[PDB]
Structure formats: structure tokens, C-alpha cells
């Protein structure tokens, strides 16, 4: 399983953000509002979660051979990931997720505060003009082979278009001492 593919727990579905390594052990990053749901996932056991405030969580793989260091492009192809970086305003980006597949757009803001009402407030979010839908959360925000974020939320959808916010991937990596595969 690669970046942007479905990960579920009981009836819930989220998308995998990035396959990473912690002291050589294979794990996967995804959104924290996803991992708060349960410790048991199709791919393994949750070993960390942070939502709200942040929006990231981590799952250790039951099957290490499934830790595919790429992002699925939903066209029978994949993008290799080799590093993690920080987003910049005007950057050309892509987002891969299990509901809508691959979408593209550009970063329009950084360090954005997002109020999700009863779900709480998140801070320091990457802002883009890329669309997303329910099910797309936790999936990959990348630029080429550089990992940049995890889908959190937004407004709109993929037909009318909308605004999406992502948790910066480097803050999740440093939280857990992880490195992208």
C-alpha cells in the first residue's frame, strides 16, 4: 500500500499519507482525526495520534513488506517519494486520496488556522486550492518526490472545487522521529 490509498477501521475510511521508518520499523502516517477513531486499522496498530491542534497520527504496519515508499497516482502509476519538505506559496502540488484520486493545484497560504466547529481548531495548516472529499483525509500532499502534507479538511468538493488544508509532514516526522521511505 502506497500514499493516498484506503486504510479503514470498522466502517471508517481514510487515506494513507506516507510510509515512513522509525528506527527501521515501518509505519504509516495519516490524519490524526482518523487515528483518534481507533487503534485497529486494516494495515496495523496505531502507535500515535494528535488531533486537534495538530492533525497527524501514525500506524505501525502488521506487514512490513507493505510499506511502499511511493504515492499512488490512480492511473496505474506511482510517484516515488525520496524526501520531505516544506511548502511554499505558489508551489505546484498534487494530492492523492481514496475518494477523488489524484488532483492538482497550488499552495495558496501557510500557517492557516482552521476551525472545524465541534471537532476543534487546528493551527499552522498548509492551504491550497486543491479539492478533496470525505474519505480523502490523511492522504498525500506532494511535489514530485518531495512529501509535503497530510490532508486534513476544507470546504467544497471536486465538482465545484474547494479549499483544502494539510498538516505539514515535517512536524509529524519530527514528532515521531520518522523518516519518509
Amino acid at each position: 500500500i502506497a500514499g493516498g490509498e484506503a486504510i479503514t477501521t470498522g466502517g471508517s475510511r481514510c487515506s494513507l499519507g506516507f510510509n515512513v521508518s522509525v528506527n527501521g520499523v515501518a509505519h504509516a502516517l495519516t490524519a490524526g482525526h482518523c487515528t483518534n477513531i481507533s487503534a485497529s486499522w486494516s494495515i496495523g496498530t496505531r502507535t500515535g495520534t494528535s488531533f486537534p491542534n495538530n492533525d497527524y497520527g501514525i500506524i505501525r504496519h502488521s506487514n512490513p513488506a507493505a510499506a511502499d515508499g511511493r504515492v499512488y497516482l490512480y492511473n496505474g502509476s506511482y510517484q516515488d517519494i525520496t524526501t520531505a519538505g516544506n511548502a511554499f506559496v505558489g508551489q505546484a502540488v498534487q494530492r492523492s486520496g481514496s475518494t477523488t484520486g489524484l488532483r492538482s493545484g497550488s499552495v495558496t497560504g501557510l500557517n492557516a488556522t482552521v476551525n472545524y466547529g465541534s471537532s476543534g481548531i487546528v493551527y499552522g495548516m498548509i492551504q491550497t486550492n486543491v479539492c478533496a472529499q470525505p474519505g480523502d483525509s490523511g492522504g498525500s500532499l506532494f511535489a514530485g518526490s518531495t512529501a509535503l502534507g497530510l490532508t486534513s479538511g476544507g470546504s467544497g468538493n471536486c465538482r465545484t472545487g474547494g479549499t483544502t488544508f494539510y498538516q505539514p509532514v515535517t512536524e509529524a516526522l519530527s514528532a515521531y522521529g520518522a523518516t519518509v521511505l
Binding site: 482525526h33 475518494t99 472545524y116 466547529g117 471537532s119 472529499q133 474519505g135 480523502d136 476544507g154 470546504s155
Partner: peptide
Amino acid sequence: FXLF
């Protein structure tokens, strides 16, 4: 304004 929602979580995906």
C-alpha cells in the same frame, strides 16, 4: 467549514 469540515474534516475530510
